Amino acid sequence: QAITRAMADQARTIRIPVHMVEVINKLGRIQRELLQDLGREPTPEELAKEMDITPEKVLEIQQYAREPISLDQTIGDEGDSQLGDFIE
DNA sequence: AACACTCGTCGCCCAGAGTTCACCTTGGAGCCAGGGACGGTTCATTTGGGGTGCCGGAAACGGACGCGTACAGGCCGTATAATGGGAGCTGTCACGGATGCA
């Protein structure tokens, strides 16, 4: 319990409430189970059927789950300049 | 090759084209005199009309005001036993100097 609560409260650059992290992890887990079972990836409507909630909220959860990237990671094929040198 | 006729060309002579030179009339062009009616002006009405400020009040209307409901985020607890990480890939060289050992 302590480890999972701390993961939810501290693992992400943008804090996500545990009530939303739980649904994100559950969605990912059962979606990978569905992919393994069915042989293809599950579509958002199919995943919403298991979430017992609407595909709009499924998509909102999906776009919420994304994490930021570093402004200083090298973007070029070689190491020449940082991503921060491309942002207006 | 010898012989006896009819036609432009010019001058001249008389009459008017039409033009000038040069004479009488009479409709003037206008100048003024006189008399409207007239249209521009002004001033009396004239009450037909615009006007209005406010309200009884009727009804919309804008909002306050109190009290219900709604997911979002947070806290909390799950009692067989479960008792020391994977993974990292590392071809540089120069080389000054500290540095842990000499």
From TrEMBL:
Localization: Cytoplasm
Residues covered by region (Sigma-70 factor domain-3): 22-88
Quaternary organization: Interacts transiently with the RNA polymerase catalytic core.
Family: Belongs to the sigma-70 factor family. RpoD/SigA subfamily.
Role this protein plays: Sigma factors are initiation factors that promote the attachment of RNA polymerase to specific initiation sites and are then released. This sigma factor is the primary sigma factor during exponential growth.
Name of this chain's protein: RNA polymerase sigma factor SigA
Biological source species: Mycobacterium tuberculosis
Full-protein residues shown: 353 to 440 of 528
